Amino acid sequence: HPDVFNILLQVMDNGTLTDNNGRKADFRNVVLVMTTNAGVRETERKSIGLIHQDNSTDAMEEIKKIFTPEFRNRLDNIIWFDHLSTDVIHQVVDKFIVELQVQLDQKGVSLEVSQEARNWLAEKGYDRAMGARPMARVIQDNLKKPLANELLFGSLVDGGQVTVALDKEKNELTYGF
Amino acid sequence: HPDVFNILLQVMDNGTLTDNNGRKADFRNVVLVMTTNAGVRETERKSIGLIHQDNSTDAMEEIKKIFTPEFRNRLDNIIWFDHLSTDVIHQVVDKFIVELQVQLDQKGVSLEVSQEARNWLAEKGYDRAMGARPMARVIQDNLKKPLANELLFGSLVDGGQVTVALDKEKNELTYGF
Amino acid sequence: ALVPMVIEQTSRGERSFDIYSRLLKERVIFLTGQVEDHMANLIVAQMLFLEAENPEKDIYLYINSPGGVITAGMSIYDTMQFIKPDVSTICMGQAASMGAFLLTAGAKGKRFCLPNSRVMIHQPLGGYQGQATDIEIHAREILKVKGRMNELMALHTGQSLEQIERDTERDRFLSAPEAVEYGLVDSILTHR
Amino acid sequence: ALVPMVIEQTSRGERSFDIYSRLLKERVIFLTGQVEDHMANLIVAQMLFLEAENPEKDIYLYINSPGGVITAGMSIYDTMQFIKPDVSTICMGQAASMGAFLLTAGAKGKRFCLPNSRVMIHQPLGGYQGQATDIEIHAREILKVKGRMNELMALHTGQSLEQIERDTERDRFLSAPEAVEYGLVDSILTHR
Amino acid sequence: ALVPMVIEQTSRGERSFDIYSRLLKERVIFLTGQVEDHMANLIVAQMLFLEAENPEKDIYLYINSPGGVITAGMSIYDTMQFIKPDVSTICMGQAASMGAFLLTAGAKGKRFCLPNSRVMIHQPLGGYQGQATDIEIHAREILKVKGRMNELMALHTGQSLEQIERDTERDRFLSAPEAVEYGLVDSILTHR
Amino acid sequence: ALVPMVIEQTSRGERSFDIYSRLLKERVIFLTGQVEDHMANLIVAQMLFLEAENPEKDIYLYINSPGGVITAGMSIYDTMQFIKPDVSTICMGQAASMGAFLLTAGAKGKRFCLPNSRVMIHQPLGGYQGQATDIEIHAREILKVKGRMNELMALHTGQSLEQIERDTERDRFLSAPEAVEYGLVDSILTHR
Amino acid sequence: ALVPMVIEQTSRGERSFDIYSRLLKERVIFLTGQVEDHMANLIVAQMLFLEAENPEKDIYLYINSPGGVITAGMSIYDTMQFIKPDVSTICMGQAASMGAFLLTAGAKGKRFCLPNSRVMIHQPLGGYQGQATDIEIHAREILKVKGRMNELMALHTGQSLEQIERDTERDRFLSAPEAVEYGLVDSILTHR
Amino acid sequence: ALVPMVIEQTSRGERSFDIYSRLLKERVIFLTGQVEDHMANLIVAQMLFLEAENPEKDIYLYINSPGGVITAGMSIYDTMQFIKPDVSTICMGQAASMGAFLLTAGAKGKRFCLPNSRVMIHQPLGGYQGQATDIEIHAREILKVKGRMNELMALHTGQSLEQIERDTERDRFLSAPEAVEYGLVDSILTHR
Amino acid sequence: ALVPMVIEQTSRGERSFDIYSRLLKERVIFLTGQVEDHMANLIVAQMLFLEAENPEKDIYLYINSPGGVITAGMSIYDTMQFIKPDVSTICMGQAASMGAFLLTAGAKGKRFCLPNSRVMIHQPLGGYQGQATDIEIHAREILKVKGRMNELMALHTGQSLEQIERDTERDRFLSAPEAVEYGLVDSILTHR
């Protein structure tokens, strides 16, 4: 509720907040980070006309309308995160694959993914609109589901490892032991 | 509030009102009397036009336009209590004068209120829109303020014959004793 | 905004009404300008509407009119004598010709006229082009209307018919006090 | 605000209707002015609408009309005869020509005129320029209409055809008592 | 208030619809006056609207029209044949020229005229000023239309083409029973 | 957008209103342009409406008018005199002819005009064509009106009648300070 | 009811639409009558509006138009080519001149014509009064437009340019099947 | 759709306001086109309305006007001087004649003019037909008005009266920079 | 339903907005038809309104205009230069005369033109009747305007002044590619 923001005026400005017993919270050694999706619904909307408009000034409307001037004027900064680029997606995919590798290592099996397979997953899952969020699903469907069957029903348990590669004809992934 | 109205209809239909403690009030032995002033408000309004017309209405219709038929259909009646006649307002002022005299008798003061004074107070206090309600004030001030003053100042005594003639300008022609 | 809105408090007090509708609600109808069919039909609709709303209350008809079509005026004339509640007519500005005709047709004792208003009366006008045979028919038709109009004036004013017959031969103008003396109206409204 | 608004209570009372709509709700339709196609298409829409609302109740049609197009009048004429509830026609002001035709077409026993109204009847008018061959076609067309108009008048008035035929050769004006005697209407409404 | 409002109850009851919209809701469309492009454009839109609302519920087209532009009328004609539900055409007052054309184009067995309607048919009218070369182009253009209209009349009425051509050489008026015999309509409505 | 809407917060909401209705609530009526019957009829409706709203408060009439029909103006003139609350008339722009007449008719001590306004007074205009007998009647009536207007000017201004008689034979223009000296207005408004 | 209202069952409530707004929601735009600046401007606004609502769905342009101003039509033409969704055009009634021009400009495979509609094409008209040098300038401009229009006709119809030029020197009328063979439209809609 | 609606969030909701009302709310009044009585009357109503809403805040008057009736313009002129808040006038497009007159009448230091706007000043126009005696009266009145306008120009511009007298003999056009030097405006707005 | 309504969901629910208002919200303004005072007065109001809504976003001005009054156009011209956000002008249909003038006045790099649109430029027109002295004054003013317009054209297009001076002697038509080369616009929009 926007009135809850008022609680932070004295926090951001004096590092303090007083509890109902009269004791004071001391935030001088606290880093305050607030996150938001304000302005996104608007920045992602298509305009009507021959020329598409630049809707990057979301900061000028939603952030300003939501946060009272006295709140805003106490911030060190308002930082706009961008949509992730495709270069980033490749890095994101590598990151998620590593997370997968760790979960697999804990079960005594390991996973290798070819570069072609990685590029394919990255290319398949990219959606500028949803950032890095869907990449975890692309990995979930292309790597984790196959693996769960191999891990759960004996194909890939103790004694083996799995290598995943992309073919070119179908651009389908391989698996193994 | 409409939920008073709704609970009254529920009582009219089943004879009971249920308490927070599960206790039930039994209305089979009671008489419900409701009052309303709706039928007297419309009649006191002046019409727009060179000729004012008669805005007398049917009070029963005014009720019809305010109250629901579910309510009306659960009544034994809707009764019009009319305005008061001259002799009635005299009965009312005389009752007030007698009560005044009782207070004066407790002190021992005899107050003679002329018939002209009695008629006038009844006429002045009475308001056909508010009936006899204002009579309390025409007598409370006109027949008492001067007595309180002569008694408290000490010009009037516990006893004595004090009279109030009314003059042609309708003034209280009070006396000492 | 040719016609302003007014706001009236009631129970909810949300209603706004063109000032003319606000006055219709008080049983006030305004007849202005030429009497024609569309206007008259609207006045008749208003009178029938008020008769239905409350048959027991007077309807006030404000007249400020130079005259008009007799036929159209007669639909007002007859509605006024048909509907149950009295129609009280008030002349302001002018009531000429058919306008005067309707003014005197109000309920007896309730025909009023503001003091600087003018009332004018005169035999009906008309005309026709055609064969001598058709001319005769139409001439007979206007004379009957004249005669009928003369009979109704005498009825409503108390003047003898012969006197009405003479007085409408040529335009006759009456000041508000003259309208009262003549019998077109009962009285003059002056100040509230 | 040419046409005033009226307020009617219901339950909530949230009803504001132009006076014309308010009276339609009381099953009153006004037919006024020249009878043409757009107007005599609204009269029909209203009658069909009222028939559906309650097939068992009368519809009151107020007529104040100088005449008009026969064709347009016939869509009204046929709708009145087709639908179930009686249409009671009331003459105010005038019912001339096509207007008189529709007046007599109301339900038997329910046709009436206010006392100072005027009803006028007469054979149809028309015309046509073109080749002698086309003139004959169009002349034949108007005579068939005249004949058809005469049959329907005789049907509704009770006059013989021969008599109704003679009486419409030239404009014939009838006073309200004459309309009753003749049979165009059944009675005169006087006072409510 | 040229067009009255009607109130209809539902669940909550908050429905106030112009009387013509009230009738559109019942699948009734009115074609009146001259056939032109804006009118035709609106009728087509209404028919498509009704077709979608319920593809299996007749649409009633009330016709009272002197004629109009063929081109505009053909967009009504084509829409009526295109759309799935039957369009039942009713002739009231008149259906002349293009109006007659559309009347006969209604669904077979569902075409009918009130007892006093007139239906009139006749070859297309037109014209053109310009150079003899342009006159020739436009003259051929109108003759093709005439031929095309003649084929459609024959198709819908059941008359042979030669007969339908002879009969439209000059204006031909048909009374309601004549229209039935000719085949312009299937029947005559009489009384509820 | 010819007339802009304004909003005001009172109890539970904004209530937008045509700026002209917003001012009617403040008991401000504007009279502008020609004085005619429909305009005058509306001003009277507004004054009666305000009188009922609160009989004890002044009504401000803003006048900016070149003149107009005397009859229509007298309708306004008499209502102002009849109704209980004072009508305070303010002249802005111009008050000519009948406009000046109404300006002086406001409540004494409350008649005022802006510094650069102009007030113009003159005897009434009119005319008639017809038989010498009718000319005589109509000429006599306009003279009675002139006399009547002359008396009312003298009454409201304090001028002798003869002085008014002389001053209005030909158009007379008065600057705001002259209107004050003459007695048409009581004062000049300057700055708040 | 110049334009009927309809109501729609969706989720939150029926609201109401005036047919054309109702059809705009279905991505149907109607182009009728003469093409001029204001109407063209409105169509462009509607197409931009629909393009934004859903860039992946076709827009249907119903055409029934005699022609119009090329410039105005040119703004429609360019918007149709610019916007992402295909614009499917349907010719009903007529598509003449500029109307025909826009008809063929719809997405290939989606140009439809109803069976009895007529399409007419011709070179542009214009004119100018002034000095011989001013005439020279304007003559060149109209010729450039003619050339430009022929280039676009050839592009959209598949006819050679040489053939388009010959075929538009004089008005050319095409019936729906002729338009298909010529290539102005792709197919004829018949029955659903 | 001549004037678009705009929506602005307020407190408990948002409100849709004709763009012209949306700007009145910001204390912006637009004076455009000829100055006449009805338009002037509306500007006066707007200024009085704004004065009451906040007597301590400036009112902006945007002028784009060729001139008009002096009388009507003076009512605007006097209201601007009477009301408490400063009226800041801005000339855009043109301010000619009476428009120029009102432009210079704004609050000193707040009279602004856009860079390409033109201001034009000239003695008043008028005329009269009648008897030599009436001509004489009317000629004197126009001359008094001329003198009066000359006095107000000198007052507001700082020019001597003699200089104003010479400069308005014939139309004198001033570019925005010339208006500043002359003293009609205080400054030129350029870019925000 | 001349202008369709569109509906969009926002926060609390859906809002119905004339399609023209729906586009104003997208910062799209249409300038079509003749440039005159009332039209300019409205465009300026819209631009001021959008500037306030969000000073940092572009305003799109769609132009399809044959020309108009220079004065009115200059108020648009000055507002565009004054307000902070860029105004991006797009030419569709035509931008002639004053329309072309405003087209080039858009923000540099943002002047766009659809491919089949025409842009036409010429020296200003005008005229005057009167005494030789007045003729000189008015001739002097139109020439100053011509000079002034010539400077602004050179400023915005990058052409030398002398070249602009020569090129506007007589109407010059430019195709969209020519407008780009000349410098009236920056680029041509083709397909999305």
Swiss-Prot record, chains A, B:
Q: Which residues form the signal peptide?
A: none
Q: So what family is this one in?
A: Belongs to the ClpA/ClpB family.
Q: What does this protein do?
A: ATP-dependent specificity component of the ClpAP protease. It directs the protease to specific substrates. It has unfoldase activity. The primary function of the ClpA-ClpP complex appears to be the degradation of unfolded or abnormal proteins.
Q: What is its quaternary makeup?
A: Component of the ClpAP complex composed of six ClpA subunits assembled into a hexameric ring in the presence of ATP, and fourteen ClpP subunits arranged in two heptameric rings. Binds to ClpS.
Name of the protein in its database record: ATP-dependent Clp protease ATP-binding subunit ClpA
Q: Which organism is it from?
A: Escherichia coli (strain K12)
Gene behind the chain:
clpA
Task: Report which part of the complete sequence is shown.
Answer: 570 to 746 of 758
